[PDB]
Design a protein around this ligand. Sequence first.
Ligand SMILES: [Cu+2]
Ligand SMILES: [Cu+2]
Lengths: 112, 113
Amino acid sequence: EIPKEMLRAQTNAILLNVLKQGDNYVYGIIKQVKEASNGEMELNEATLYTIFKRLEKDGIISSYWGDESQGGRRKYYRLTEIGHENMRLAFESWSRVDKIIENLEANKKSEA
Amino acid sequence: GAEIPKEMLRAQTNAILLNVLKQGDNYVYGIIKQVKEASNGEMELNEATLYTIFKRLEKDGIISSYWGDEGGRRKYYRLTEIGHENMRLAFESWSRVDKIIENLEANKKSEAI
Ligand SMILES: [Cu+2]
Ligand SMILES: [Cu+2]
């Protein structure tokens, strides 16, 4: 199986990169990800809300109301500067981890 | 704040340990030694953290353990056939996830035109 920890990490990863490309609202994120995957990836709405609560807690995304001029009120999400840094740190740490593994493969090889 | 959350730190540590075992059955002190050298002395994992992670991985069937021969007798750990398959499933799903975002970036770009 893909364990539950990894599925959530994949969904977290998708949501942050979508918001990196532009402010968005939940149904639009789900629609856009389904489109980018030719209908194959249907994100679970319930799962977005728990992740969004966490990301808002950590200051990684913020929200604001739009579409009020028509008589409605939709919540939009934005990647914050803390969020941009978190993505940079995730890239940099994962590159460090990957380099350690590459080094290990080599050290194993050169011993031979 | 912005720092790497505990979930991702655990995922990164899991990644390292399973990739060490992918490259060959091994024992805790030997894993710690190898990671320390592959990280140019900077990452010296504590044996307790390995025991914590291995207890979980063994419970979930991803690794198993067995004794070597002898002035001591080391406990070896191995990636199971489920563990190997999990790595392939992980590679394949993360590759799909990455391409989805790549598509969204491309779509975003070409629309701007
Ligand atoms: Cu990424
Ligand atoms: Cu990997």
